[PDB]
């Protein structure tokens, strides 16, 4: 049906839907919602609706615009709009709040709990605000407007707003003539009779792509998966025991990263990675490519002893499951028994994105030839050695 | 007017989406969803909807509050809501579950698989439930819900609720008069004719701040970035081959964390972090500060040999790229050749967030003087030693 | 029924379509031409997927594994109701594509016409009311919102007459003025062109992205700047970062990362010593994530030449009672020539063995240790490292 039964009922919904849209927003035209900057638990916004109009109106409203009148602006009602019309005449809205610290917007100091909008009845006979109410409720459903309560109220002026001296639910106004005229008594001359439209702020508020809206405390971000109907979720939770926040990824079996860094006592590192290393024949350094470091982090390295013997070049330690060790070179150049050991040196230097590792094993004197890779009292870059190389980045 | 059908339908979808919302939350107002604590496979909730109302209602419902009434309390339906009216009248909902361990919530014992909400038909000609159901499907599309999988059922009571004895798809009820009239034939006086609603959300549904809307399977969470037009995305996926979920973060170059923990065969670890260590002059114990462990984790330490010789005090190993080693102290007190080695001990003890590290090197007898840091057959906490200290936390 | 919802829903979808160069990683078909104007028809074949029972025009990725981006359903027909879909008029401008010689234009403008078929033509003002209220509800603005009469043109239609929505509503003289020109050579229609003026929400299908530098945040009791995360692009390193650093601890189950293109898990360590008796040591291999293989490395921590006559199992102190002499008794510690640590993976268990070479002529000629070799000695502690990699 595209025919408007009651123009007035239509207007009540049209205005209400925009009040709802406004109450759901933390930002408007990329600026904080004005209503959220104060810290009182209540505020009454006036029937003239200046507070709902753009600040670039001929008469300037309270709703922020972007830097430029250049761009299209988000808006709620026309600059000249007036809803103080008809039998149900807009009377203003009561906003209720609670204190709120937004995790990322410092300008926000409270959050909307509930918005109660009042539409004063100006029909000749008070009782038939009941009929008026019903057409509003009908029109809500027709226009897909979802409010959380409709009530008939009596409101008196307050210190800075209005309060409800008496309230009766819509249902009990039509379907309970005992409570109905129990309520209309109180309709004295400094009280205003009105339809009250309540909007509760629920978990249904949309997560905006600008990140202006936070996930509720203890809520979860979830995926459907091919595992079936079980959802895979993650969350940020705060534990009072220890007073630390946690990004809880434990419903997921594997977190799969590319680059990865973390902090240890203030310092930033990447996870250590390790390799098994031995020297090649010939007595030269073992060259190991330096890992690539993320921005701002420097290369680190450590070599530690795994296996060793005093055989020097006469060995093969490259297999992780067995060691071949043929003895120490004797003065006549032949392989003899394994000499006794006095020390091991492992040195490393980074040049040009390559680590050069050098080593020597010190042995008892008088065994080795005077000259050569194994000579004097030293086995140089020996094959009779395996080490584990550790690499990581840090700042 | 016969737009009583569309209005009845609006309420059906309104209630059904709140029921679906409730079913998707493991916590409500910071407390475990009451329906997830038990361990049965199914449960039927009653048409009176007490279970869906807040416990702070004049007549208390079962939905928890935060405790502090100052707080915004999330809610699903009004305290005086009653959806047992109209041609499609709420009759209760069937929840099916599977057993479940929540990694961070010990109070949870099961997981919702699905919820079906039943609306019994109170029209006097049964055949016209198809017509009523069409309005429901229409109200569903308007709110972003799927138009598929609606069913017309016959349900009967048993001790734990109502079960379906017969079912036909909305589509077959409409198009296949033979199937329709065969289904209706089983609609005996003892069975309740109902529309079975199980809402499914289209991909266009907005994400909500309570987390109750999950991402579609294979959907990603994406950010615009200064890199240009390409998005940067993460996703949660289930591999049917390995039967594991993965949080794929690889499309991002670096995952940058503060504290970090992970699991290895059921145990919680932090990443190993390492320092290069040597003893300072004088032969005394060394102190290394313990890393700060996340709540619940305990400090671990391991020291491994990197370089060593029998020089004892006559050495400097503090550089990673060179070693100064000047031989073992002889009996006259002068530096001599390097003595031969029998062993190396690295020892460590945790005291008040400090690791006390001691070391010694056993050597052949009859070299060292009889007194001093290096004496007898022992080099105490020698300088001629470098070791890598590994630290991590675990439970 | 759902007429007003439908008008805005179709119009938004068409607008979305219009705004897209590719649909399902294939060129938007409407761009593969060079004409300045095209009218697309009421039956909406052009907006339906090609894989519909009756083929539509919207391309497909080819493989049905993933959900195919779509606009309307295969059976959709919006030619009902008092606001009945009449077709969409697109205006284009010239374009030269860098890689596809068939793309020769880009969209400049689209308007969707919904013809009026209500009992009384005057009631189109009411119908336009529901539409505009729905449109604004969803964060849209209509561009030149107007009621029109259209006649067939060279291409598509031209608007022979038009009245703004406000004029039709607030000027009864302008309205019948317009309404009387409604002859048989024209169709009465609502002309809808939607612009997104509200900020939009993140969506279940993941099609909408967080804005550059947006933070995704969670309320907590810890307060500000402790529960937010973001993806930012560092302009100096030209790298993207997932920034979790506000949160005290990221707590994972399994975890993998890449080192120079290779996938790893973090190394995990244990303190190990051999049991009495010279037997080999078994260490259970950690569980690897799908497609990774086990790695192991043992390194020396403490040792002596005591062999069996020792206890190194305590991390804080070492007992070493000397080397077994020829008569089988405990004597002085022998001198050393080497240490081997060996390991082999067999059926999810790492078998670890060790030997310490020592000076000859000390050990007895038979027994647990003989010759010049200590096998799997107690006088040793090593650190064992495990990780997975591909």
Author numbering:
A (entry chain B), B (entry chain C): 29 to 423
C (entry chain A): 34 to 423
Sentences from the paper on this structure:
The toxin-coregulated pilus (TCP), an operon-encoded type IVb pilus (T4bP), plays a crucial role in this process, which requires an additional secreted protein, TcpF, encoded on the same TCP operon; however, its mechanisms of secretion and function remain elusive. Here, we demonstrated that TcpF interacts with the minor pilin, TcpB, of TCP and elucidated the crystal structures of TcpB alone and in complex with TcpF. Repetitive TcpA units form the filament structure, whereas TcpB displays multiple functions, such as efficient pilus assembly, pilus retraction, and CTXφ uptake. The structural analyses reveal how TCP recognizes TcpF and its secretory mechanism via TcpB-dependent pilus elongation and retraction.
The structure of TcpB domain 1 adopts an α/β-roll fold similar to that of other type IV pilins, but the α/β loop connecting the α1 helix to the central β-sheet is outstandingly different. The α/β loop of TcpB consists of 64 residues, which are remarkably longer than the 38 residues of major pilin TcpA, and has a disulfide bond formed between Cys85 and Cys107 in the loop. This disulfide bond in the α/β loop can also be observed in domain 1 of ETEC minor pilin CofB and likely stabilizes the longer α/β loops of these minor pilins. This experiment demonstrated that TcpB (43.5 kDa) is a trimer with an estimated molecular mass of 120.0 kDa.
